[PDB]
Tab-separated table of C-alpha atoms and ligand atoms in Angstrom:
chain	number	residue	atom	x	y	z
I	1	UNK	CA	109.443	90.537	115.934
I	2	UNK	CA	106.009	89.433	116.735
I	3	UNK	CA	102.331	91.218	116.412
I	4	UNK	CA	98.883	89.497	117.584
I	5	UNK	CA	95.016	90.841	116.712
I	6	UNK	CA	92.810	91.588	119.101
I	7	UNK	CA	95.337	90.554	121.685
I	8	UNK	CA	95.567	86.976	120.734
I	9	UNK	CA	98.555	85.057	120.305
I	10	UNK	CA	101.677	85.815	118.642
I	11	UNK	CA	101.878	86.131	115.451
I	12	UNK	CA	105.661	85.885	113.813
I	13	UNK	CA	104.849	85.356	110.418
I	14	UNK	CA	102.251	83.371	107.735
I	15	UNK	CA	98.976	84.530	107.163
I	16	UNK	CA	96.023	85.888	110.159
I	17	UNK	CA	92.581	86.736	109.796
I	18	UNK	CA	91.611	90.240	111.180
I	19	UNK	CA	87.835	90.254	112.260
I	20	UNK	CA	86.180	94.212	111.445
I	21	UNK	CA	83.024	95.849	112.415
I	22	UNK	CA	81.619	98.207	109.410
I	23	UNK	CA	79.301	100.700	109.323
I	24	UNK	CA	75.890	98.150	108.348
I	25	UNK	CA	74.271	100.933	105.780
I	26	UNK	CA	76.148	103.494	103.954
I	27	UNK	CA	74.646	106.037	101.118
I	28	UNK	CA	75.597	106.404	97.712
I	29	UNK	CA	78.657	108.430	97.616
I	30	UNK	CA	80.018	106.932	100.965
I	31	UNK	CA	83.274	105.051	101.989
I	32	UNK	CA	84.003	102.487	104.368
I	33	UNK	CA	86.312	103.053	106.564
I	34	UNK	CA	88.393	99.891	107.894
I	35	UNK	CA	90.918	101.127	110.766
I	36	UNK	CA	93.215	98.051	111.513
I	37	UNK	CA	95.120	100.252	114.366
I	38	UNK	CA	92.126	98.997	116.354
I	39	UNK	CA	92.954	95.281	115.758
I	40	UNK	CA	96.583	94.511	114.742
I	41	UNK	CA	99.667	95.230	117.206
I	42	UNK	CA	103.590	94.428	116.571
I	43	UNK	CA	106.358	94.918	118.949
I	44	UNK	CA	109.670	94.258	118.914
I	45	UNK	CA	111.320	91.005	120.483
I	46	UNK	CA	113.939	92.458	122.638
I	47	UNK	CA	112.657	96.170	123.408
I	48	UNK	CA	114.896	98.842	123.583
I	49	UNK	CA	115.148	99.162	119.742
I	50	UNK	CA	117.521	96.711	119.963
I	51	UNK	CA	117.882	95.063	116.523
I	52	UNK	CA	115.615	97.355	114.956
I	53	UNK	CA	112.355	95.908	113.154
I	54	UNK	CA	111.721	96.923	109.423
I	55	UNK	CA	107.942	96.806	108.376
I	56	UNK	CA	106.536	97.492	105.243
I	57	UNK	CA	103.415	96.140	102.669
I	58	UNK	CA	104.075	94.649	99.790
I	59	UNK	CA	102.871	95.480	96.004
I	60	UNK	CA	100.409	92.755	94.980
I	61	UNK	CA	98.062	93.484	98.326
I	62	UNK	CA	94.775	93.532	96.785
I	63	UNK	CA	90.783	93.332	96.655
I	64	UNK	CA	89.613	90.298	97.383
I	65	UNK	CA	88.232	88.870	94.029
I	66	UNK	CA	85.234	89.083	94.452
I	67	UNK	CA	85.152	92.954	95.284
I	68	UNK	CA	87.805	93.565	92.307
I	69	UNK	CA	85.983	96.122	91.029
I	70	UNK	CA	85.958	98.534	94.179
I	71	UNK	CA	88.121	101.106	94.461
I	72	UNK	CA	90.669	102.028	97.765
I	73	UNK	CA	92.954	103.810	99.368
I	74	UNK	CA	95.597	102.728	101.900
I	75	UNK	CA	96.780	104.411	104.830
I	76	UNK	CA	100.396	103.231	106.237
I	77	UNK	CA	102.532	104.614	108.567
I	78	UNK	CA	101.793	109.214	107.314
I	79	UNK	CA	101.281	107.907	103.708
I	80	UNK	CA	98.517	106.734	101.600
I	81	UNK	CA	98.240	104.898	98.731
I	82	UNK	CA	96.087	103.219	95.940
I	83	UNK	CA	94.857	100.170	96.608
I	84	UNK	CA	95.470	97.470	95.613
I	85	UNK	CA	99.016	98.252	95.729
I	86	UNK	CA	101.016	98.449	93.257
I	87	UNK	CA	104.003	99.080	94.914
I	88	UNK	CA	105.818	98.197	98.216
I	89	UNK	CA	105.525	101.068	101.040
I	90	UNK	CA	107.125	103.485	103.060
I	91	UNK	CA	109.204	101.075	106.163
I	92	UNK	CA	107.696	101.356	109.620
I	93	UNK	CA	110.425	100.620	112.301
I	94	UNK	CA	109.570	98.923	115.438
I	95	UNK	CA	111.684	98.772	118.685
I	96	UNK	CA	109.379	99.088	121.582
I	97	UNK	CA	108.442	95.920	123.433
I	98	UNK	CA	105.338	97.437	123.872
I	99	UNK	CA	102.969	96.831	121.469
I	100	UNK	CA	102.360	99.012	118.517
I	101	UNK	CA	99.202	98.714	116.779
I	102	UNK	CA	99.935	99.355	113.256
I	103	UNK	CA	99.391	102.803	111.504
I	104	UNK	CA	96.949	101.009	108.869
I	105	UNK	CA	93.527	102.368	107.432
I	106	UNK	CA	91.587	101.000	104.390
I	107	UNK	CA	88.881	103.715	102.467
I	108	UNK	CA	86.855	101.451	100.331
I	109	UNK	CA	84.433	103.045	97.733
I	110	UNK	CA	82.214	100.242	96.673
I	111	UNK	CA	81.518	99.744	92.867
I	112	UNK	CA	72.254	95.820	97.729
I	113	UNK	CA	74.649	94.258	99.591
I	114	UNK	CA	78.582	95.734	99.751
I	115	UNK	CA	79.869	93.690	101.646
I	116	UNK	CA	78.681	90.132	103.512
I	117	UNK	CA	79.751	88.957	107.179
I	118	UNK	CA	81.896	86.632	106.977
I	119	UNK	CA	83.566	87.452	103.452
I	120	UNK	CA	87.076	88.508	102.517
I	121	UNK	CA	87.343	92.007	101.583
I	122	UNK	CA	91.234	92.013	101.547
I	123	UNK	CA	94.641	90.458	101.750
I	124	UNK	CA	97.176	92.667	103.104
I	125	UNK	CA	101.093	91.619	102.548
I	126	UNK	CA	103.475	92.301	105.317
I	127	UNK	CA	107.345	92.145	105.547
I	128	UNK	CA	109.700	92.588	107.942
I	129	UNK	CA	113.547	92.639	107.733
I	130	UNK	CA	115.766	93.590	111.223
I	131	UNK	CA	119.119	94.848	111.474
I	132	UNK	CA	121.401	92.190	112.807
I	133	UNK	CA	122.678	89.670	110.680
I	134	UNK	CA	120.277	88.688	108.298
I	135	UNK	CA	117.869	90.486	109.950
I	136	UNK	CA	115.609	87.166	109.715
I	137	UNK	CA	113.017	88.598	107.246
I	138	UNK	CA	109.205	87.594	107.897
I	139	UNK	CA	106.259	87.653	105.500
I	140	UNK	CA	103.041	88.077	107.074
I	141	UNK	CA	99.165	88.146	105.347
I	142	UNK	CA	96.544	89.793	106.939
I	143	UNK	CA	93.410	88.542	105.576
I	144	UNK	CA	90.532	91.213	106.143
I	145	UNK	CA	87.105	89.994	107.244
I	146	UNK	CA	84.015	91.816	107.514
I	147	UNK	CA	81.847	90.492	111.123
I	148	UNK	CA	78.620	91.884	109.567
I	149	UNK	CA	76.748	93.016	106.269
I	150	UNK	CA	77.118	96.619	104.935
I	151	UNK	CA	73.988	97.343	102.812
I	152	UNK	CA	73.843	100.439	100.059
F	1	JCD	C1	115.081	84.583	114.478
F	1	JCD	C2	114.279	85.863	114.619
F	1	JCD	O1	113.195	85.976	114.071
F	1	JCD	N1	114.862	86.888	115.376
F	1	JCD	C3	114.221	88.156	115.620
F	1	JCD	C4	113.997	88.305	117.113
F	1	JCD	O2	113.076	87.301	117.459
F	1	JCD	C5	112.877	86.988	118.808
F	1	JCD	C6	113.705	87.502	119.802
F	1	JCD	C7	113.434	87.131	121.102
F	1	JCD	C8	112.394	86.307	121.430
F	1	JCD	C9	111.570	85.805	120.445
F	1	JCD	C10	111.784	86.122	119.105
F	1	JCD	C11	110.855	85.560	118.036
F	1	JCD	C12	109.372	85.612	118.278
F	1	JCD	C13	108.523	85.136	117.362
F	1	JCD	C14	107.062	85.181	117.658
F	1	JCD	O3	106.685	85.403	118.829
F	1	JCD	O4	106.227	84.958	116.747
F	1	JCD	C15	109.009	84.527	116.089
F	1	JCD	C16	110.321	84.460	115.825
F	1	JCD	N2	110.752	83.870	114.606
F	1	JCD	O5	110.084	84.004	113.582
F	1	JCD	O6	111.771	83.198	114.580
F	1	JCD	C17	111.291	84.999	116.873
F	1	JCD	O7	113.440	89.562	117.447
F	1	JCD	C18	114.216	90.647	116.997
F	1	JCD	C19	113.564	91.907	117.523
F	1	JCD	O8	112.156	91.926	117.254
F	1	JCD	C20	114.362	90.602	115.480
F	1	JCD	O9	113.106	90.665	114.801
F	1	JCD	C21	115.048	89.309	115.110
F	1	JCD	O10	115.219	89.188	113.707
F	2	JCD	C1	108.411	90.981	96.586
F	2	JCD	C2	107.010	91.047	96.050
F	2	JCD	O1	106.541	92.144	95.789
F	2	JCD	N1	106.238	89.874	95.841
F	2	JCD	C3	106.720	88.559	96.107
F	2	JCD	C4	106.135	88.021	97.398
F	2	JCD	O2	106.665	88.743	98.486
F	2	JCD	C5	105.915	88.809	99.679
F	2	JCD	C6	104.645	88.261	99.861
F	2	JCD	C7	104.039	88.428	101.087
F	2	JCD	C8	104.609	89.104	102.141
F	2	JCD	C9	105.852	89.651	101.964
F	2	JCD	C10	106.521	89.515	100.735
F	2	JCD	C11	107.904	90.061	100.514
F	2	JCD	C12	108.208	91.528	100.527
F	2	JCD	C13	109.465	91.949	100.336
F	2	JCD	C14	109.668	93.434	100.384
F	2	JCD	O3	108.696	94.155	100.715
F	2	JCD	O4	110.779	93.959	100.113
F	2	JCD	C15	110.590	90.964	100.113
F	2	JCD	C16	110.337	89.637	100.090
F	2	JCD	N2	111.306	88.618	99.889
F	2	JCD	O5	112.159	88.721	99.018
F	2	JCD	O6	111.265	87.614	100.587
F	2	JCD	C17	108.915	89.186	100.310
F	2	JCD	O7	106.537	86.682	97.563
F	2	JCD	C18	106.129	85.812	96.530
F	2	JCD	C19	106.643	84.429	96.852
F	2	JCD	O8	105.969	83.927	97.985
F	2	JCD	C20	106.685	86.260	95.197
F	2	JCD	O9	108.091	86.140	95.173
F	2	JCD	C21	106.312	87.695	94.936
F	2	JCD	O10	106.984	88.125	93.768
């Protein structure tokens, strides 16, 4: 099982930052919207479904501190959720040697400046488990980074 961002290298486990482009002002009342399908793609090893990839995030995925106080909802794979999360998701399974780019959306409702380039605005956990054997499980972190300023 493997993924890359932005078409970079692979990526089979251990922790990748993921480089976003925000809206720069947003108005009272507004959301950002963070859509990591655009950036992050996983595939399967083997293709065919062959040994069948398990994928799912992890309770604990948060804020990062300093935006602890904002509110969010993730989107994964038909479901969303409260963010941080504070429990593990639905599973994602991944066959296709093709890549995939994952079914993952952040809403942020900030709680001046909102957010500066260049700062972490979240950690995302990652698992995956396959189907063989031990199914060789993986733990990923994808580390969320805003490429410019959002001003309110
Ligand atoms: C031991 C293991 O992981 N086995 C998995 C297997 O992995 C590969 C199969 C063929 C070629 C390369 C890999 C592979 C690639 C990478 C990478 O590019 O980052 C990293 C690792 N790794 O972490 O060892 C392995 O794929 C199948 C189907 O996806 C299941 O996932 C299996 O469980
Ligand atoms: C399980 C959990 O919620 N938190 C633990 C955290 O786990 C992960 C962290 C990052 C990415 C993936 C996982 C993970 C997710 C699953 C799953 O989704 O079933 C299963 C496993 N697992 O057993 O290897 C790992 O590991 C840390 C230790 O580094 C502590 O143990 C935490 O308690």
């Amino acid at each position: 099982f493997s993924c890359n961002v932005d078409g970079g290298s692979s990526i089979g486990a251990g922790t990748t930052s993921v480089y976003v482009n925000l809206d720069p002002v947003i108005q009272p009342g507004q959301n950002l919207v963070v859509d990591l399908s655009q950036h992050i793609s996983c595939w399967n090893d083997y293709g065919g479904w062959y040994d069948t990839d398990h994928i799912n995030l992890v309770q604990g995925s948060a804020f990062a501190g300093s935006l602890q106080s904002y509110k969010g909802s993730l989107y994964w794979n038909n479901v969303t959720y409260p963010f941080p999360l504070t429990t593990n998701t639905n599973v994602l399974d991944i066959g296709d040697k093709t890549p995939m780019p994952l079914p993952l959306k952040l809403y942020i409702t900030p709680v001046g400046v909102v957010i500066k380039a260049g700062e972490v605005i979240a950690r995302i956990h990652m698992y995956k488990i396959a189907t063989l054997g031990s199914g060789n499980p993986r733990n990923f972190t994808w580390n969320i980074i805003s490429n410019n300023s959002v001003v309110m």
